[PDB]
Amino acid sequence: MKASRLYTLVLVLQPQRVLLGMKKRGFGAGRWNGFGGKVQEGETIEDGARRELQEESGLTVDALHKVGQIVFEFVGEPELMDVHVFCTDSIQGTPVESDEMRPCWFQLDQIPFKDMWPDDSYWFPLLLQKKKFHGYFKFQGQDTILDYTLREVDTV
Ligand SMILES: Nc1nc2c([nH]c(=O)n2[C@H]2C[C@H](O)[C@@H](COP(=O)(O)OP(=O)(O)OP(=O)(O)O)O2)c(=O)[nH]1
Ligand code: NA
Ligand code: NA
């Protein structure tokens, strides 16, 4: 059995558009994604998600709703990444580029899947349907999935 490290991921999903950020450096650089990062000691997972959203996108939200959890495993890495996925539809400021991320809105018929992590093609459609999910993906490097599981759930 492996140890896991906690991460968050936040999608601002509105009726006709979703906010993504182009990751400018670090893990997943070059891919559009939601905002997020490592959970810190002492904070709830939701509050860590709110913190990362503010730090990486400039947006400050009162609350986030948990929609999924995805575990990532990489060949050659002993530690799993346990990613807790949150949404909101409700914002009240403008996104601001950070060192981590350049925010950009996408219409919901223009989700840039080819420039997102490959696994997002599987779970993002459930997020768009307002379904809840648990997933697991094993990667060789950045591009190749060797094994995965995905399930819709009623409670995350
Ligand atoms: N959409 C998507 N997001 C992923 C996948 N794998 C993965 O870790 N993530 C998310 C979780 C986090 O939001 C982010 C990874 O955290 P990070 O490296 O940006 O963490 P951080 O901000 O604390 O890092 P840093 O500034 O210290 O370098 O990417 C994936 O396959 N798909
Ligand atoms: Na971060
Ligand atoms: Na990050």
CA distance 56 to 27: 14
- For the annotated binding site for 8-oxo-ATP, the residues are 27, 35-38, 52, 56, 117-120
CA distance 22 to 88: 19
Protein residue closest via CA to atom 14 of ligand 1: 37
Instruction: Give me the resolution in angstroms, 1 decimal.
Output: 1.1
Question: Using a 6 Å CB cutoff, which residues line ligand 1?
Answer: 7, 9, 26-28, 33, 36-38, 72, 81, 83, 100, 117, 119-120
Domain boundary assignment for the chain: 1-156
CA distance 33 to 104: 10
Phi, psi of 25, deg, nearest 5: -165, 165
Mutation test of ligand 1: which of 6, 19, 22, 33 has the most ligand atoms closer than 8 Å to its C-beta?
33
Structure tokens at 86: 């949150």
DSSP string, 81-149: EEEEEEEES---S-----SSEEEEEEETT---GGGS-TTHHHHHHHHHTT-EEEEEEEEETTTEEEEEE
The ligand with the least distance to the CA atom of 138 is 1
Position in ligand 1 atom list of the atom nearest CA 100? 26
CA distance 89 to 87: 7
Structure determined by? X-ray
